[PDB]
Amino acid sequence: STVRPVAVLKKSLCMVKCHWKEKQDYAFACEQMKSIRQDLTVQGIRTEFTVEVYETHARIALEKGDHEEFNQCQTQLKSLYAENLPGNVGEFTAYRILYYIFTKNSGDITTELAYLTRELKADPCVAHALALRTAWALGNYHRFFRLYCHAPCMSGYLVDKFADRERKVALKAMIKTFRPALPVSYLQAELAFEGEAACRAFLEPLGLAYTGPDNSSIDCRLSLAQLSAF
Amino acid sequence: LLDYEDSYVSIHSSGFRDFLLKPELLRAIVDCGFEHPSEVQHECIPQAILGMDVLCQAKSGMGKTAVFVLATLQQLXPVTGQVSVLVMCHTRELAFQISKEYERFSKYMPNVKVAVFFGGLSIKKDEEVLKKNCPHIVVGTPGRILALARNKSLNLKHIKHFILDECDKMLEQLDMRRDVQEIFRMTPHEKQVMMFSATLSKEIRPVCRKFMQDPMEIFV
Amino acid sequence: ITINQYLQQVYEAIDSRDGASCAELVSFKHPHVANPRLQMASPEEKCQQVLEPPYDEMFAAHLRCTYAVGNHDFIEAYKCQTVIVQSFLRAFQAHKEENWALPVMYAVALDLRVFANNADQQLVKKGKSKVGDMLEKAAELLMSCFRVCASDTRAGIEDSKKWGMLFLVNQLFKIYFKINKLHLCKPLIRAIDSSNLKDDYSTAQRVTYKYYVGRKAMFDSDFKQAEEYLSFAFEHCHRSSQKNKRMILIYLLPVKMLLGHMPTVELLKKYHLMQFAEVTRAVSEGNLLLLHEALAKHEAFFIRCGIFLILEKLKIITYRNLFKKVYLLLKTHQLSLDAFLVALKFMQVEDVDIDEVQCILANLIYMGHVKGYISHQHQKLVVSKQNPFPPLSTV
Amino acid sequence: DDEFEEFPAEDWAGLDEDEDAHVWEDNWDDDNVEDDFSNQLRAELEKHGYK
Incomplete structure (x- = not known):
């Protein structure tokens, strides 16, 4: 059972892709993908089909957030690309930079930059990832969320992992700066909230003691003490 | 305008190849199918390869045993008729499992020899095994190891990697702790000590780290 | 023989x-x-x-x-x-x-x-x-x-x-x-x-260890520790081994610039590191355009060294310097959030608006570089009237 | 070939180590705003209506 022919493994991968499209069963998809790449690795198969399998599993593991599985897939894809395989080098280099942003690995980002070519950096996905990394490191939440709004490919799926913490940092910066009140419409615009309901759902657990009975705006002077809690 | 007034998978991109392990060890790692190291592996392998003491508390199934298996296989200088790695655990099942892990991670290093001893079997057989082909790794229960060290059938003067599996279970008891203390006393003072267990209570942590010289402690 | x-x-x-x-x-x-x-x-x-x-x-x-x-x-x-x-x-x-x-x-x-x-x-x-x-x-x-x-x-x-x-x-x-x-x-x-x-080893081994550990700390964004270790390594080096001192300076310059200390042109010429001259001048002057041009010109060298990310936070320092220039030129404490927009547009920054100006100034105030607040009602940033831009060393 | 090369001697005790006399500048941050870049910025602000 450990030795599985490549043709049967291709058929299984196609069936799992179709099943994920039809039903989106994440536990079944992850179990199937893990078995597939286990059978690939026990046989030491490093080829275009291997890079395709790892790409498919990494893309599946972003619709349902699984940082561990995505990290496994991407750290295998790095070596698969280094072995002169076609894959999607620009796309998954963008995803690698984005995951390093998520885990806050400045050294890994520097290492990735040290091996970027002109034709790679010309890719739109990696260009968006580099712009997002610059906005995040520079603390530019406006550019960060402007790029997060229209994120090419599945970049937004990665950004969603640290979108909430970036929003919290941006809100701390805004409360420390916007006085005597901060309109919630400004939060809606800056933090890239697709709905007043979603914006208020994000705002509610913090408990920032909004001004006015209707809670039209955040009272930042009163909420300054609340900043340290979150 | 008023004026302003004053887990199971590591999250690091570092595979087993990034641990600078032996090629014969990396081949076995790939063969067994370990794609990406666990968090405890990523935290303990670099420290354990350098021959330094380790204290680890991690849940079962997180690749805890493979950590010290790779650690002891990396720094193994195998010479005939000499034991340099000793593994002690309170259960025969764990000893058999760790012996199987050692066998699995050494299919590309024919020099390394591993032997297993436990209760329920005649000590004469263990003495015959030690004399006929003295291994470089010995895995066993504290009682059998203590008996073999007492009856002068096993040479403990060459131990350089003395490690415990489920250190909590052994160090909670009294007879087991006495046997462990005696065996550690017989071993040389220049060696590496590592202790792995599932649940390390704060009462056993001092008596657990009493056997190590500035160990790296990690608890999950 | x-x-x-x-x-x-x-x-x-x-x-x-x-x-x-x-x-x-x-x-x-x-x-x-x-x-x-x-x-x-x-x-x-x-x-x-x-x-x-x-x-x-x-x-x-x-x-x-x-x-x-x-x-x-x-x-x-x-x-x-x-x-x-x-x-x-x-x-x-x-x-x-x-x-x-x-x-x-x-x-x-x-x-x-x-x-x-x-x-x-x-x-x-x-x-x-x-x-x-x-x-x-x-x-x-x-x-x-x-x-x-x-x-x-x-x-x-x-x-x-x-x-x-x-x-x-x-x-x-x-x-x-x-x-x-x-x-x-x-x-x-x-x-x-x-x-x-660790304090008794040979001087050469201690210096090499301090340099490498400070470089790793800088690689891990531990700037105070990196500054301390690399300062020790730079202070203790043999006169004959000039290449080692130049390698120390390569990774010590970004950290000292981040902390607020600028290398001198005399030092850069002495240790043959002229790639940092334009970067230092741009950061000192608050010249975003010059900083971008220098980082683009010496991009290969900085990428090979591994200090491009650490040098692009000199852009953060450049933001503060440029806004200080704007504040000093205007001589007003209730600054308009459009003067900074004009300055950023003059620095040829693509797609810059009052929203991005507000974001940049909010990040600066959060990091402590600017002592002030944003009204957002009259579209004006008010500064502290005393220490509006605190020294980078204190921050 | 750019790598930290070995030192010639294992110790020097600081007698032959190089000491750098104030190679760091910390007084560059000042209220003086007069250079060419400052003049360019002032001209741009004056063009856009800010004095």
């Missing part, structure tokens, strides 16, 4: 435990290596009536390695040197409470690293394997040497092998930085910190 005389000298050195003499008779930085008679193909028959094991095998491998280095072909020279390290470690571990083979270990490890580099060059030329493959094996051998040295703790201070620990740590650091596996330096840093001799 004849081979018999050389081996008799080696035997006398080993018998008298002359560490310096034995190191000179095994290192490749000695004129005896150039002696054609000493270089032999199969000294296996010899050295056995002279040297007790494993010294016989070690020095026979050294003779073979000298013959190799004479006849190029560094791959099997490195193989012979690996044999030398493996044979010497077994003898070094036998020395109980006597660190007389430390110079021998130093020379052997240095030659092992050099031959690993040369064999990697030859292997790259052959095309069989990628660059840095022999660095991993050299790192494994140096790890074995390090653990052999470190396991000796019960010996006295005057006879402890722990004195030979920082050298091996530095060699491992060099290998790791060559192969970019900087995550492997944490156990070595912890071991050196826990050691009681």
Whole structure:
């Protein structure tokens, strides 16, 4: 059972892709993908089909957030690309930079930059990832969320992992700066909230003691003490 | 305008190849199918390869045993008729499992020899095994190891990697702790000590780290 | 000198435990290596009536390695040197409470690293394997040497092998930085910190360790620690070794710039680092356009060094400097959030609006660079009227 | 070939180590705003209506 022919493994991968499209069963998809790449690795198969399998599993593991599985897939894809395989080098280099942003690995980002070519950096996905990394490191939440709004490919799926913490940092910066009140419409615009309901759902657990009975705006002077809690 | 007034998978991109392990060890790692190291592996392998003491508390199934298996296989200088790695655990099942892990991670290093001893079997057989082909790794229960060290059938003067599996279970008891203390006393003072267990209570942590010289402690 | 005389000298050195003499008779930085008679193909028959094991095998491998280095072909020279390290470690571990083979270990490890580099060059030329493959094996051998040295703790201070620990740590650091596996330096840093001799090692080894650890700390965004370690390393360097001082400065300049200290043009010319002149001038003047042009011009050099990310936070400092320039030019405390927009547009920053100006100023105030707040109702930023831009050193 | 090279001597005790006399500048941050870049910025602000 450990030795599985490549043709049967291709058929299984196609069936799992179709099943994920039809039903989106994440536990079944992850179990199937893990078995597939286990059978690939026990046989030491490093080829275009291997890079395709790892790409498919990494893309599946972003619709349902699984940082561990995505990290496994991407750290295998790095070596698969280094072995002169076609894959999607620009796309998954963008995803690698984005995951390093998520885990806050400045050294890994520097290492990735040290091996970027002109034709790679010309890719739109990696260009968006580099712009997002610059906005995040520079603390530019406006550019960060402007790029997060229209994120090419599945970049937004990665950004969603640290979108909430970036929003919290941006809100701390805004409360420390916007006085005597901060309109919630400004939060809606800056933090890239697709709905007043979603914006208020994000705002509610913090408990920032909004001004006015209707809670039209955040009272930042009163909420300054609340900043340290979150 | 008023004026302003004053887990199971590591999250690091570092595979087993990034641990600078032996090629014969990396081949076995790939063969067994370990794609990406666990968090405890990523935290303990670099420290354990350098021959330094380790204290680890991690849940079962997180690749805890493979950590010290790779650690002891990396720094193994195998010479005939000499034991340099000793593994002690309170259960025969764990000893058999760790012996199987050692066998699995050494299919590309024919020099390394591993032997297993436990209760329920005649000590004469263990003495015959030690004399006929003295291994470089010995895995066993504290009682059998203590008996073999007492009856002068096993040479403990060459131990350089003395490690415990489920250190909590052994160090909670009294007879087991006495046997462990005696065996550690017989071993040389220049060696590496590592202790792995599932649940390390704060009462056993001092008596657990009493056997190590500035160990790296990690608890999950 | 004849081979018999050389081996008799080696035997006398080993018998008298002359560490310096034995190191000179095994290192490749000695004129005896150039002696054609000493270089032999199969000294296996010899050295056995002279040297007790494993010294016989070690020095026979050294003779073979000298013959190799004479006849190029560094791959099997490195193989012979690996044999030398493996044979010497077994003898070094036998020395109980006597660190007389430390110079021998130093020379052997240095030659092992050099031959690993040369064999990697030859292997790259052959095309069989990628660059840095022999660095991993050299790192494994140096790890074995390090653990052999470190396991000796019960010996006295005057006879402890722990004195030979920082050298091996530095060699491992060099290998790791060559192969970019900087995550492997944490156990070595912890071991050196826990050691009681970290302030008593040789000055060269201490300086190299401080430089590498500060570089790693900068690589991990620990700027205060990196500044301290790299400042120590820069302060303590030999006058003759100017290349080492230049390498110190390469990674010390970004951290000192981030902390608020600017390198001088005199220093840059003295240590031949003129890639930082335009960057320093732009950061000092608050010139975003000049900073972008300089970072684009020296992009290859900065990427190769590994300081591009650390130098792009000089953009954060440049933002503060440019806004301070705007505030000083306007001489008003209730500044308009459109003057900063005009300045940013003049700095040729693509797609800049009042929203991005507000975001930049909010981040600056959050980081403490600016003491003020944003009204957002009258579209104006108010400053503190006293210390609106605190010194970068305090922040 | 850009790598930290070995020192010639194992110790120097600081007698022959190089000491750099104030190679760091910390007084560059000042209220003085007069250079060419400052003049360019002032001209741009004046063009856009800010004095």
